Short mmCIF file of C-alpha atoms and ligand atoms in Angstrom, two decimals:
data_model
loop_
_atom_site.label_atom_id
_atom_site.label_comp_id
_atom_site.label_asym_id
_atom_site.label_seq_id
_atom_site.Cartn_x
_atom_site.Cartn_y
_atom_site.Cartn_z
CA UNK A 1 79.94 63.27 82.82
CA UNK A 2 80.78 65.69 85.56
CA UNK A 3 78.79 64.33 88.86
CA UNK A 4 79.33 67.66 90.48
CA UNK A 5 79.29 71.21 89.32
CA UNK A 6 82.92 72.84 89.69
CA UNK A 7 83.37 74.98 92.78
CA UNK A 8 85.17 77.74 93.73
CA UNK A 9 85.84 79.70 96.60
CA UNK A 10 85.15 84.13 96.78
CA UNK A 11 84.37 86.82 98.63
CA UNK A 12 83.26 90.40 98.62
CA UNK A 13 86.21 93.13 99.59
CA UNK A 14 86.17 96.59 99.26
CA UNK A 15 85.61 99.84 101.72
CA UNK A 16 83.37 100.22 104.63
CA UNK A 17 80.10 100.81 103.52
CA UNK A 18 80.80 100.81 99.57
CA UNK A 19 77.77 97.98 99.59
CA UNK A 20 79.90 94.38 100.15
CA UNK A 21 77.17 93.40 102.20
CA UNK A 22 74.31 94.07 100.20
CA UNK A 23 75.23 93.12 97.15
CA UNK A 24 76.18 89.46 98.71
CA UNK A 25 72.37 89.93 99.92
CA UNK A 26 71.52 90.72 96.12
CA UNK A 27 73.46 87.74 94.62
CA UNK A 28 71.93 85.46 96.40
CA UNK A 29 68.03 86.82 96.27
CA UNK A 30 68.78 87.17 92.18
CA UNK A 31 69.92 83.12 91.86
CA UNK A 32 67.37 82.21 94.50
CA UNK A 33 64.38 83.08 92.02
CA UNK A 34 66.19 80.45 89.80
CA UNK A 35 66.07 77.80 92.70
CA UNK A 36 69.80 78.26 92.68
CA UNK A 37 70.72 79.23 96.21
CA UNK A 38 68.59 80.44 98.94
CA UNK A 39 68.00 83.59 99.69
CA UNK A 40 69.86 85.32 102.94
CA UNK A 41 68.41 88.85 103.73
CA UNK A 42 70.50 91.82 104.31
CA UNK A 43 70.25 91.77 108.23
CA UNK A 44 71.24 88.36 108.45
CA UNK A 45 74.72 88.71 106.20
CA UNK A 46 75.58 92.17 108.02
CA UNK A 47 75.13 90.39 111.41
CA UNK A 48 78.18 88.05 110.92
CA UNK A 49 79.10 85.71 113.28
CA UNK A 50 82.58 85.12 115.49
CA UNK A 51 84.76 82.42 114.60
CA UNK A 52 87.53 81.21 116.20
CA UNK A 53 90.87 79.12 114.85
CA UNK A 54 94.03 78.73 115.73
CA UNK A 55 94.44 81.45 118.76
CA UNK A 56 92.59 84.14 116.14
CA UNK A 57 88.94 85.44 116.23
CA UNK A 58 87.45 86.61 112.89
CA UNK A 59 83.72 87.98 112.10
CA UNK A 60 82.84 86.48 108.48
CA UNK A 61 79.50 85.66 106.87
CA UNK A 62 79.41 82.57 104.40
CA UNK A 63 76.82 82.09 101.93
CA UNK A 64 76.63 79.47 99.44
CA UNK A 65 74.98 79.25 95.93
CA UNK A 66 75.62 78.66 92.61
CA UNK A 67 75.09 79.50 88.70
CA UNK A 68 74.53 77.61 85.85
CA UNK A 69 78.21 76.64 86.10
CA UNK A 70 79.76 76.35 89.33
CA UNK A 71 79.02 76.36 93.03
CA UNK A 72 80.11 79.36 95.39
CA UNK A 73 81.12 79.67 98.99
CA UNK A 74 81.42 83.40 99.77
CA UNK A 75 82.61 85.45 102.37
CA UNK A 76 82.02 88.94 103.57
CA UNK A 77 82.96 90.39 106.68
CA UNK A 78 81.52 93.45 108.98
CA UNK A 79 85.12 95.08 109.51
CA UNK A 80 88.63 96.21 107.63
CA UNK A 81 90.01 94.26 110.34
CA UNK A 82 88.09 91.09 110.00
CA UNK A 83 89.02 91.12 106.35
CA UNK A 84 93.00 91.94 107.14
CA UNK A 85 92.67 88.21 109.25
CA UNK A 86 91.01 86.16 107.36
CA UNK A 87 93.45 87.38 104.14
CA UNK A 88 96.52 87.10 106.27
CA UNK A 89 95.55 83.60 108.10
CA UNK A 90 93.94 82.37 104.80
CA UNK A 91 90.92 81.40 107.02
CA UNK A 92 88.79 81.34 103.77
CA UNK A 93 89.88 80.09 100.40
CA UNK A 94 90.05 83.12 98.14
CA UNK A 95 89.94 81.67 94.18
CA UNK A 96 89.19 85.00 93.37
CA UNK A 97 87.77 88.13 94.99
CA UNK A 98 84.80 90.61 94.13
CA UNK A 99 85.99 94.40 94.97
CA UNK A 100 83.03 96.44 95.52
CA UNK A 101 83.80 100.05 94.59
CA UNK A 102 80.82 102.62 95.58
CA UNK A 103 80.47 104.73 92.55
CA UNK A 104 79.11 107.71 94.44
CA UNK A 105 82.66 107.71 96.47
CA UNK A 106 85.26 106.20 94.27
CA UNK A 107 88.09 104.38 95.24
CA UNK A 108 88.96 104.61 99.20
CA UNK A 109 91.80 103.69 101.49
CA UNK A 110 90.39 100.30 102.22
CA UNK A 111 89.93 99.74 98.37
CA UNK A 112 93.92 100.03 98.13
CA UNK A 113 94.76 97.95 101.10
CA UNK A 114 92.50 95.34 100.22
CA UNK A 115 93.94 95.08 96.35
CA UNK A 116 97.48 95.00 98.34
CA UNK A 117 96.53 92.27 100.39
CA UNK A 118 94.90 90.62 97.82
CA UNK A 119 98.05 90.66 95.66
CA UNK A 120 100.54 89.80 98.53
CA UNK A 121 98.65 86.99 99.84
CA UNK A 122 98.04 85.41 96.45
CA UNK A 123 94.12 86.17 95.10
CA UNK A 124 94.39 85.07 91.99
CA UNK A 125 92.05 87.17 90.31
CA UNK A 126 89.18 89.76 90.61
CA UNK A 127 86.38 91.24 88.98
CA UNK A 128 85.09 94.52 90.18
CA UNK A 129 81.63 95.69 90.57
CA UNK A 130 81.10 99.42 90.73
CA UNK A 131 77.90 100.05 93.17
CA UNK A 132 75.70 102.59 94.00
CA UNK A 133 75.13 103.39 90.29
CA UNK A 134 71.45 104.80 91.37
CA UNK A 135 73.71 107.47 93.02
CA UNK A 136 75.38 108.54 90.23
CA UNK A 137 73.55 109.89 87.19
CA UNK A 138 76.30 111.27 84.98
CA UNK A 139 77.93 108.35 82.28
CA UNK A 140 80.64 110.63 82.29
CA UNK A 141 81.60 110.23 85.83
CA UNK A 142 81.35 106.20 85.73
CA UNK A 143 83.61 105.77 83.39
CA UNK A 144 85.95 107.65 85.26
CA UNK A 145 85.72 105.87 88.10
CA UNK A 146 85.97 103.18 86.55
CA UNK A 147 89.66 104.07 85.03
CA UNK A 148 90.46 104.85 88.36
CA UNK A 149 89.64 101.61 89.88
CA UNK A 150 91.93 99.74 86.48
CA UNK A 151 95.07 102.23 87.70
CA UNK A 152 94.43 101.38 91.21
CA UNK A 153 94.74 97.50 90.24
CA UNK A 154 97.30 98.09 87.62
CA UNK A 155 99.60 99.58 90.69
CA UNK A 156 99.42 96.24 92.43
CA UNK A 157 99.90 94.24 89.42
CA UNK A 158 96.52 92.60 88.94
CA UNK A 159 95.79 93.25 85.02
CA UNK A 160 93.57 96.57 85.17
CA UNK A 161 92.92 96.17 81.75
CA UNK A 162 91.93 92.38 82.03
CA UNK A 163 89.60 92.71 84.83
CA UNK A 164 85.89 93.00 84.28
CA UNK A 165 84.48 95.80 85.91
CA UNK A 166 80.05 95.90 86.09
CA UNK A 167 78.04 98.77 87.43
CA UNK A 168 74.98 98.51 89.04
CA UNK A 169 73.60 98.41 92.35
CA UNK A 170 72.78 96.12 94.82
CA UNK A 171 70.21 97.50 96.65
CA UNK A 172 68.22 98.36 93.74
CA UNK A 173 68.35 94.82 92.65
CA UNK A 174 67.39 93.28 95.73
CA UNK A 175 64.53 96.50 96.35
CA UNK A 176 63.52 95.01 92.45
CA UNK A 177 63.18 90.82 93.25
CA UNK A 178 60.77 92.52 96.15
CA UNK A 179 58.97 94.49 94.22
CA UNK A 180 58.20 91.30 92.26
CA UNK A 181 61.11 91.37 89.30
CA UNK A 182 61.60 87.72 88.08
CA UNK A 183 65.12 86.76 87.90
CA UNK A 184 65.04 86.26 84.46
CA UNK A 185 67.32 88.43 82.37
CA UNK A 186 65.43 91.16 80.42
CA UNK A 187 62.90 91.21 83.12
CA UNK A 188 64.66 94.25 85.27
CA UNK A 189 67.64 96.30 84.44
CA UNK A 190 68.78 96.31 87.79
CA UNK A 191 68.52 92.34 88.57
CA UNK A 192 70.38 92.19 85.44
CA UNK A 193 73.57 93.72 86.56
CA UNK A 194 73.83 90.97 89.16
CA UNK A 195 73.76 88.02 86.46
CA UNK A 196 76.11 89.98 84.51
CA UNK A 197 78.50 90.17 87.47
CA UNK A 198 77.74 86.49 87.91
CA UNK A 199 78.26 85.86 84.32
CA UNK A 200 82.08 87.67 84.89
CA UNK A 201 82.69 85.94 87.83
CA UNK A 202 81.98 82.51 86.05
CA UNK A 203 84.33 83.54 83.06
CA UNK A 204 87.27 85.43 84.35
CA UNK A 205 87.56 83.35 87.95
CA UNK A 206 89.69 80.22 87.37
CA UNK A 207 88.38 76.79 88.69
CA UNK A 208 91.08 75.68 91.82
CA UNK A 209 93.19 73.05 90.82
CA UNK A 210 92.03 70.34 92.72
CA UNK A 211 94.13 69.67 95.82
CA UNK A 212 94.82 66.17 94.82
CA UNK A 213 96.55 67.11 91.63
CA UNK A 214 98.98 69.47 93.05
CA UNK A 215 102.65 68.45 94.02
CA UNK A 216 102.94 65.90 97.22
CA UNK A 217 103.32 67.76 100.27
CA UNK A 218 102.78 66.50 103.60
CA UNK A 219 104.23 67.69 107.38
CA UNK A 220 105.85 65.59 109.35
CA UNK A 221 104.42 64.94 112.79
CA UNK A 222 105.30 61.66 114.34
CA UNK A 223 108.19 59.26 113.39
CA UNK A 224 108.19 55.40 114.08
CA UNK A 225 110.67 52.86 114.13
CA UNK A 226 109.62 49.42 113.21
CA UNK A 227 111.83 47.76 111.37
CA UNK A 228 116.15 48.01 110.52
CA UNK A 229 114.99 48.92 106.78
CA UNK A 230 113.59 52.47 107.25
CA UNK A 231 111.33 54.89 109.19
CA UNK A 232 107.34 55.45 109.36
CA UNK A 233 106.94 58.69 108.77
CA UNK A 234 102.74 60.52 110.14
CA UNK A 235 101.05 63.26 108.88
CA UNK A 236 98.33 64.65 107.35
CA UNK A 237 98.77 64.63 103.35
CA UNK A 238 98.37 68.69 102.72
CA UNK A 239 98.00 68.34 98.95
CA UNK A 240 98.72 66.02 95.80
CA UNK A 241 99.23 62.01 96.37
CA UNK A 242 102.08 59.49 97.05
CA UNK A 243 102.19 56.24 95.66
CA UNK A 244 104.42 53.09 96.27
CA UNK A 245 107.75 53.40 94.53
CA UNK A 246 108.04 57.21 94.59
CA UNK A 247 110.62 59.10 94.99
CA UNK A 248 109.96 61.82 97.54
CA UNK A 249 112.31 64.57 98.71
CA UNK A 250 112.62 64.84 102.87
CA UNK A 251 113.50 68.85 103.34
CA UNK A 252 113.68 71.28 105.93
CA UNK A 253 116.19 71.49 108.48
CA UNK A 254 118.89 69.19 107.43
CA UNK A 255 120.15 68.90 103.87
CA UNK A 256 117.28 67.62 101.42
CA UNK A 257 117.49 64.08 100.64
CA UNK A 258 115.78 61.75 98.49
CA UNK A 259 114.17 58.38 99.49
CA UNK A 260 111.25 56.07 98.42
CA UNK A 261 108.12 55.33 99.55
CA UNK A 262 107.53 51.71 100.54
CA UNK A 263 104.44 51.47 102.13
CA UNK A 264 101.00 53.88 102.72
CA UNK A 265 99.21 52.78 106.02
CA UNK A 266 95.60 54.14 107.07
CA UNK A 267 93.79 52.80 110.17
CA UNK A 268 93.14 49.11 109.19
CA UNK A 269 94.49 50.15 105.56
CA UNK A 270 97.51 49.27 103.20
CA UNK A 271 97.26 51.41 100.82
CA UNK A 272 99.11 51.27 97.08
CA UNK A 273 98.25 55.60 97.23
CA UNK A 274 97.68 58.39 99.55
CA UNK A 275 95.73 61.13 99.01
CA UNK A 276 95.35 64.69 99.82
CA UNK A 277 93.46 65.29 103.24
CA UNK A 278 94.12 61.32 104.43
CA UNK A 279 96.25 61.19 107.55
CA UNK A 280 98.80 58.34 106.62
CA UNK A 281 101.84 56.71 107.69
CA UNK A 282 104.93 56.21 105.20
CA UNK A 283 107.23 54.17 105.37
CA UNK A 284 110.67 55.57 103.84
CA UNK A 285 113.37 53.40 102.57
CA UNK A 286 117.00 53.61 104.26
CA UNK A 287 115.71 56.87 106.58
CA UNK A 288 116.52 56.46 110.44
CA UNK A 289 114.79 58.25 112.86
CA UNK A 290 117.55 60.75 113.65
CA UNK A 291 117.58 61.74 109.87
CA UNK A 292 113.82 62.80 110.40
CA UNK A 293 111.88 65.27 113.06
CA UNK A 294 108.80 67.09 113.40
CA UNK A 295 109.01 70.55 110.89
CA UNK A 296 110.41 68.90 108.10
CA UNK A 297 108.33 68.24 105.10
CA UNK A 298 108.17 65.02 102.27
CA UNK A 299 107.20 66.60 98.89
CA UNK A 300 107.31 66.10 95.30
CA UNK A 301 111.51 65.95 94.70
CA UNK A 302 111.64 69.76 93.31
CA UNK A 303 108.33 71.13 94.54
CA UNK A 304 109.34 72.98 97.73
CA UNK A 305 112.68 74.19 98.88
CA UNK A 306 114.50 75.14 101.86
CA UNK A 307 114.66 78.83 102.90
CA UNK A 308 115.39 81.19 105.88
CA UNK A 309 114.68 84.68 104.56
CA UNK A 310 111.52 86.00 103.40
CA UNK A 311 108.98 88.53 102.97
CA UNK A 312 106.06 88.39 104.37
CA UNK A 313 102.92 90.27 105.41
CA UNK A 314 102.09 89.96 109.62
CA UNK A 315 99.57 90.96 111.52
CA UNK A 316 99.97 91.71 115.12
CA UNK A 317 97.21 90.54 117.44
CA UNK A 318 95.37 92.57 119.99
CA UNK A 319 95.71 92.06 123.70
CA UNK A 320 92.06 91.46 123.18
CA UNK A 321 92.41 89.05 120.87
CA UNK A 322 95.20 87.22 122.90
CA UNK A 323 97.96 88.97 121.98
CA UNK A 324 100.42 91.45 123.65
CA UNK A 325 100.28 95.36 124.07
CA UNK A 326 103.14 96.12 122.89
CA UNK A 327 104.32 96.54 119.07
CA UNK A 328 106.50 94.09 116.80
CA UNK A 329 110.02 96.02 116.38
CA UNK A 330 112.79 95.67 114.40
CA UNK A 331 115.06 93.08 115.37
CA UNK A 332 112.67 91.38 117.40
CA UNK A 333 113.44 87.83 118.00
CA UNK A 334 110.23 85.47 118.48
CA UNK A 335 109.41 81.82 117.49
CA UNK A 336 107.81 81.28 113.97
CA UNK A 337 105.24 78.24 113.87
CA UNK A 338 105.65 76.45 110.46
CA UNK A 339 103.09 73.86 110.07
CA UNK A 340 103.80 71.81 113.25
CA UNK A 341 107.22 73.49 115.23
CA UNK A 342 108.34 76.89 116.31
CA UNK A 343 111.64 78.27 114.79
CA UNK A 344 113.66 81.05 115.99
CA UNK A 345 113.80 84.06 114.01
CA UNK A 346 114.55 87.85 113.33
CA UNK A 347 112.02 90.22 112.20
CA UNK A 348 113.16 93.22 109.95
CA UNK A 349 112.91 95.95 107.05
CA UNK A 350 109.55 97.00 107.87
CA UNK A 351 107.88 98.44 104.56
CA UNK A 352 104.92 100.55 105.09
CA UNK A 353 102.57 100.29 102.20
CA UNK A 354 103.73 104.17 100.59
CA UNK A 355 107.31 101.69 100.22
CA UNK A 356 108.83 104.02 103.36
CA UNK A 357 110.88 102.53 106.12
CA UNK A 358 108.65 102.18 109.59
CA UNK A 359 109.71 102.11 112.95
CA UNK A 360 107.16 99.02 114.07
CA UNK A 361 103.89 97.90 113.92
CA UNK A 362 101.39 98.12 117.07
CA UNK A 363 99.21 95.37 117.68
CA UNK A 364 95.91 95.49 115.13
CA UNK A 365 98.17 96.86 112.44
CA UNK A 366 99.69 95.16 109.59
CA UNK A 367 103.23 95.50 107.74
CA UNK A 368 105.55 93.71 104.80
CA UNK A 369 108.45 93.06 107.26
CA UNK A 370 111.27 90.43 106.01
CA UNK A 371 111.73 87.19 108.38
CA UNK A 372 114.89 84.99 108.81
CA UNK A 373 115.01 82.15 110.45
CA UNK A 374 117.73 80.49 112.82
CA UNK A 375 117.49 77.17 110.67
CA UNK A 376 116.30 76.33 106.91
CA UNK A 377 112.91 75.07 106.48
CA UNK A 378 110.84 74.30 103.29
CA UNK A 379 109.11 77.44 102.53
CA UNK A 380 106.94 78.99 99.38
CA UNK A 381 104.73 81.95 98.32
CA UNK A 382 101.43 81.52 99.87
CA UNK A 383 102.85 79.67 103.22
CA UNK A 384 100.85 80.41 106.50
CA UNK A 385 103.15 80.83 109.82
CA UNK A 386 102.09 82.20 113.22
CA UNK A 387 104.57 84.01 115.17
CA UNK A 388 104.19 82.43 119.01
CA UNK A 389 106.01 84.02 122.53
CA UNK A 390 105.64 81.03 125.18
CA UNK A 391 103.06 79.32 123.10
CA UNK A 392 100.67 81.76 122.93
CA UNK A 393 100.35 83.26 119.25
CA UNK A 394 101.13 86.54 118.92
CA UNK A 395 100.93 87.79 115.72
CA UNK A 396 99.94 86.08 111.83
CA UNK A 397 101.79 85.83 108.91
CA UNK A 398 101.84 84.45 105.02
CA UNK A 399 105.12 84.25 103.11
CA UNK A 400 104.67 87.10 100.31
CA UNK A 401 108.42 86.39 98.63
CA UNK A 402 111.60 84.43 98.81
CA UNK A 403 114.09 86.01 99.59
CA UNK A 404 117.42 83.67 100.35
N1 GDP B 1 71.92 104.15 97.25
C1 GDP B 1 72.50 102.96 97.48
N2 GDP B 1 72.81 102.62 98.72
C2 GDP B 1 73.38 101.39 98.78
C3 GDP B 1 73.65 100.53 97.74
N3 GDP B 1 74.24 99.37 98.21
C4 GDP B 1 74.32 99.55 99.51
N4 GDP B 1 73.83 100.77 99.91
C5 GDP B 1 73.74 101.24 101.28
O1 GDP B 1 75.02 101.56 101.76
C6 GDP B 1 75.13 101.22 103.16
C7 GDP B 1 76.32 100.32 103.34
O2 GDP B 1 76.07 99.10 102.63
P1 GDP B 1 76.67 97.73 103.18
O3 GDP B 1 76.25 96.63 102.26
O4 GDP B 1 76.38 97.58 104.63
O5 GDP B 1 78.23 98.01 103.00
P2 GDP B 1 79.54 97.20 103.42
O6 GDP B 1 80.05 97.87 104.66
O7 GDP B 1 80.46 97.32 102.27
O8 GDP B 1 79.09 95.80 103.68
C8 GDP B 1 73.78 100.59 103.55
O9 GDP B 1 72.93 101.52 104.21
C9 GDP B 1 73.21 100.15 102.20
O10 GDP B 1 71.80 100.08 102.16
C10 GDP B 1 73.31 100.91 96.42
O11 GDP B 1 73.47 100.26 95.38
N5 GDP B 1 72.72 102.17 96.39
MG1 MG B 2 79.15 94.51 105.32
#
């Protein structure tokens, strides 16, 4: 018995008025007649609020609902740029992502950009759904369309022939559930395209693993000595579980070792396991202090490995947002924030996304550039970093590939 309907985590992406927002609207007036979410109105998505994390400032709606088989949280943003932070930051969870393609204009510059970004930062998957279909009366002309948009996704790598791709239109369906259409398929052609797109996204979406079954990986933050027999080691478990016994791998900035886990405290706990998301203390067998700082990482022996060179995509932060005026160059030398310290490093090999050389990147921009750091740290695909000048963060990145 499953106590709770699987989740996942999406969002709409797409060009500037192609219809991200109002098909959001749609999908949730559609599952609302089936008391499956509640409805949220057109004006209220499109007026998307500010958040703020970690020295960045994003606009992004978030709606909830669910189908028959899983639960949703979904963003959609007003702006290009709001979408360009919250891929690059990973401020939301993307399990998969809906493109919305306007029929009536085909495939546009933010389509691209937002299938690269969604490939470099690691979406796993998307289904597509063609809008504006009232717009367009010719069969002919959908189905090209249509092959453009699989091309366009084939050229990033995402399966084009894989992904399901449904036409319809949003504001139709929505104009249809006012006009009194039911929700139930059959009842309106229109309102029917949405559960079809929901049916899609239900199939071809893959559940998250859940965080707790993933390989150990927790950042080290604090170190205590307490006894001769090994350290305490603080930090907030980022994935998987540890369990008495273990062996765990200690890597980042000095050669990897191995050592095993003696003890899991919590506040007024001792613990035989900890789990993603607890804050613990470990205690690790035969480590001293000195052999363990603040950047390092205790994983799964194998999971992660040490790296200083990378590619990566960055974004460079406004002077409005906080950031500085002027743009990230070649060569430039700032500190790199990796889960809990700065590290020195070299920016270079700026790709623009044609695959040409570029000369830098001015601040609201974003570029593949390749990082090295001064020292090794444990590094994958997927990693967030922010790149800091006297504290302050300048600019956002996530590790794209490994490169030494
Ligand atoms: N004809 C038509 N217009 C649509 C459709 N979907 C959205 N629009 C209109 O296109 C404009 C942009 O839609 P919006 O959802 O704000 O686009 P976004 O910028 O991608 O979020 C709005 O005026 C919508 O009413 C559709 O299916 N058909
Ligand atoms: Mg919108």
């Amino acid at each position: 018995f499953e106590r709770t309907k699987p989740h996942a985590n999406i969002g709409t992406i797409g060009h500037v008025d192609h219809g991200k927002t109002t098909l959001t609207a749609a999908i949730t007036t559609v599952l609302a007649k089936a008391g499956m979410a509640k409805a949220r109105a057109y004006a209220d998505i499109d007026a998307a609020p500010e958040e703020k994390a970690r020295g960045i400032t994003i606009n992004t709606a978030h709606v909830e609902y669910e189908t028959g088989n899983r639960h949703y949280a979904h963003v959609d943003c007003p702006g290009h740029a709001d979408y360009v932070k919250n891929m690059i930051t990973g401020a939301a969870q993307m399990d998969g992502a809906i493109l919305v393609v306007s029929a009536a204009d085909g495939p546009m510059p933010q389509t691209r950009e937002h299938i690269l970004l969604a490939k470099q930062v690691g979406v796993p998957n998307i289904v597509v759904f063609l809008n504006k279909e009232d717009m367009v009366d010719d069969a002919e002309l959908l189905e090209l369309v249509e092959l453009e948009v699989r091309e366009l996704l084939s050229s990033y790598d995402f399966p084009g022939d894989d992904i399901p791709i449904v036409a319809g239109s949003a504001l139709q369906a929505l104009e249809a559930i006012q006009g009194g259409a039911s929700g139930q398929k059959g009842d309106n052609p229109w309102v029917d395209k949405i559960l079809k797109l929901m049916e899609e996204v239900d199939a071809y979406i893959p559940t998250p693993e859940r965080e707790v079954d993933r390989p150990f990986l927790m950042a080290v933050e604090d170190v205590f000595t307490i006894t001769g027999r090994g350290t305490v080691a603080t930090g907030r478990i980022e994935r998987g579980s540890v369990k008495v016994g273990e062996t765990i791998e200690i890597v980042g900035l000095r050669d990897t070792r191995s050592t095993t886990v003696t003890g899991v405290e919590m506040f007024q706990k001792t613990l035989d396991e900890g789990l993603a998301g607890d804050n613990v203390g470990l205690l690790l067998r035969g480590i001293q202090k000195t052999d363990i700082e603040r950047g390092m990482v205790l994983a799964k022996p194998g999971s992660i490995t040490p790296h200083t060179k990378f590619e990566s995509e960055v974004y460079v932060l406004k002077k409005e947002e906080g950031g500085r005026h002027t743009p990230f160059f070649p060569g430039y030398r700032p500190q790199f924030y990796v889960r809990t310290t700065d590290v020195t490093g070299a920016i270079s090999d700026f790709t623009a996304d044609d695959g040409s050389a570029a000369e830098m990147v001015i601040p609201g921009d974003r570029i593949k550039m390749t990082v090295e750091l001064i020292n090794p740290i444990a590094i994958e695909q997927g990693m967030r970093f922010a790149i800091r000048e006297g504290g302050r963060t300048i600019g956002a990145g996530v590790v794209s590939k490994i490169l030494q």
